[PDB]
Amino acid sequence: VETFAFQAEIAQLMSLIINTFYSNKEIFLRELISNSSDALDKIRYESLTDPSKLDSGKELHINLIPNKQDRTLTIVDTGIGMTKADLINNLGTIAKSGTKAFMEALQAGADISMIGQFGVGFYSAYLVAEKVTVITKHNDDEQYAWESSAGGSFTVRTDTGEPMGRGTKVILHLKEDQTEYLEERRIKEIVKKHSQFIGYPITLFVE
């Protein structure tokens, strides 16, 4: 297991997300679904010229998996996936510059819900989760698990769990007071409100 420090700007972004009073927490799901859609777009485009990139799985979809027993909400996609290098480099995001652009878009009146416009929507996960695990598999690398409970550090390790084929799984270990996001009707409501026109099948698993 390797432990890394977040860049100062990202730790600041996470501290802001965790500590700022902001009731509209449901946007985290929109942001994660958007990321999955972006990753799915990428493997789709690459497969147009090289269909063998789909040997790791032809289906392009997003699954939402609540587990009330574990208090986890998991978002799984079969997009392009991330390499180990991507994970360490802020999960394939432009997080340093994006955080800068977000930080003082906020000072120009913006609110937290615009976070995705600055490429760092992922970190909105910390509105609802005390810990986030990101398990990912890119065609060119092995399957890795990234994890952080904030506090300035993250870990990366080779994943031992179920083979994913290709794509990304974001596991949200929910805060005690945020269990509404495990309820079927709440999830459906949020998907219909914010993600109605995502161009990939979104399947909400039941328990």
Ligand X SMILES: COc1ccc(-c2c(-c3cc(C(C)C)c(O)cc3O)noc2NC(=O)C2CC2)cc1
- Compute the distance between CA of residue 7 and CA of residue 29 in angstroms, rounded to an integer: 24
**Is 122 flagged in the annotation as binding?**
yes
- Compute the distance between CA of residue 154 and CA of residue 184 in angstroms, rounded to an integer: 30
Give the nearest distance from C-beta 70 to ligand X in angstroms: 19
Region 88-127 residues binding ligand X, contact defined as CB under 6 A: 91-93, 119, 122
The structure tokens listed for 142 are: 């092995």
- Residue 113: CB atoms within 10 Å: 16
Three-class SS state of 62: strand
Region 37-56 residues binding ligand X, contact defined as CB under 6 A: 38-39, 42
The structure tokens listed for 94 are: 């432009």
Nearer to ligand X, 48 or 69 (CB): 48
Among 13, 26, 71, 81, contact with ligand X (rule: CB under 6 A): 81
Nearer to ligand X, 116 or 178 (CB): 116
Among 53, 79, 148, 195, contact with ligand X (rule: CB under 6 A): 79
Closest Cα to residue 19, out of 127, 103, 116? 127
Cβ within 8 Å of residue 61, ≥6 positions away:
40, 77, 78, 200, 201, 202, 203
Nearer to ligand X, 45 or 205 (CB): 45
Binding residues for ATP: 35, 77, 96, 122
Which stretches of the chain bind ligand X, using CB under 6 A? 32, 35-36, 38-39, 42, 77, 79-82, 91-93, 119, 122, 134, 168, 170
